Design a protein around this ligand. Structure first.
Ligand code: AU
Length: 323
């Protein structure tokens, strides 16, 4: 392990102020420009729009264009300019630091896995929610595909067993993962029709592809709202906050390009322009940065440290999502 924050200290402890409870949704394949709040022509986030205290960040660039590359960078101390995907797994990352400091770290995954982020931590702190041995919400669709909202079930049991501690829960979404966007949402989210249902994107009518993509955003809108609603049920005992950032965007036929993973050197902007939301309870004292702050995945690690009142030299001056 190569360390970067051995100096990290927590200024205030959960035995002398309210314990802090944060959900970080790690999104999947969502594009900034298909978000209602960023000026998209469709209301793709109706439920989040009903919730007070949500900040939408209109200028966020992902570290990369793929799950393997972006997800470790999101939790890195190095920043996009110095990040090396090939050695990322051996670097101390922001979750190693918080866990060392006594924050209870939980990773639930309905996507793939943590791409090495949870590897130095006890396996008991990672849970696979792609399988029904954990996820109670899979038989709601003709594919029996397990749903992101299933990662919320039983979180009260996790809180109860971590009584009075700081807690950071990562929820790694299936989200808008392609090519089969149509599979990614239940029927209640099939607002935009007709929809593409083949693995040959490009052979699909372009509008029908967009329609399946947008329906999957409505399922994500629903999941993020439910996440905040779950947090609100603990807001008296805990200072609760919710951070959402997508790992990367998606090409939807622009210049003949589909899916993602284009190398950064020639990747279209659609693959790196991602949405980000921050919600917090009024009690927490946490203040969002300006909506239009130029932001990147580099802001995640300082944001997670500030949420728990932790300082570390390597990111002392680094712009975050919050003050
Ligand atoms: Au991804």
């Amino acid at each position: 392990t190569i360390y970067h924050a051995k100096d990290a200290v927590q200024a205030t402890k959960p035995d002398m102020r309210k314990p802090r409870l944060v959900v970080f949704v790690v999104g999947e394949t969502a594009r900034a420009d298909h978000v209602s709040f960023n000026g998209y022509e469709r209301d793709t986030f109706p439920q989040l729009a009903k919730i007070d205290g949500v900040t939408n960040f209109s200028n966020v660039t992902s570290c990369g264009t793929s799950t393997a590359y972006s997800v470790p960078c999101m939790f890195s101390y190095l920043g996009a300019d110095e990040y090396d995907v090939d050695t990322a797994k051996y670097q101390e990352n922001v979750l190693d630091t918080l866990d060392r400091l006594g924050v209870s770290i939980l990773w639930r995954d309905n996507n793939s896995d943590s791409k090495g982020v949870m590897d130095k931590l006890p396996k008991a702190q990672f849970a696979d929610y792609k399988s029904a041995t954990n996820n109670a919400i899979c038989n709601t669709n003709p594919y029996n595909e397990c749903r992101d909202v299933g990662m919320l079930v039983g979180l009260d049991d996790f809180v109860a067993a971590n009584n009075g501690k700081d807690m950071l829960i990562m929820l790694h979404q299936m989200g808008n993962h392609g090519p089969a966007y149509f599979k990614r949402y239940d029927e209640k989210f099939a607002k935009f029709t007709p929809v593409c249902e083949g693995n040959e994107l490009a052979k699909c009518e372009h509008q029908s592809l967009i329609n399946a993509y947008d329906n999957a955003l409505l399922a994500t809108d629903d999941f993020i709202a439910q996440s905040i609603q779950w947090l609100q049920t603990h807001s008296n005992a805990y200072d609760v906050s919710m951070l959402y950032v997508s790992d990367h965007g998606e090409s939807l036929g622009e210049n003949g390009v589909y899916l993602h993973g284009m190398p950064n050197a020639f990747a279209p902007k659609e693959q790196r322009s991602v949405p980000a939301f921050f919600w917090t309870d009024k009690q927490t004292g946490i203040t969002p940065m300006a909506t239009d702050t130029v932001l990147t995945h580099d802001a995640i690690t300082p944001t997670l440290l500030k949420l728990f009142d932790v300082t570390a030299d390597k990111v002392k001056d680094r712009t975050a999502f919050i003050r």
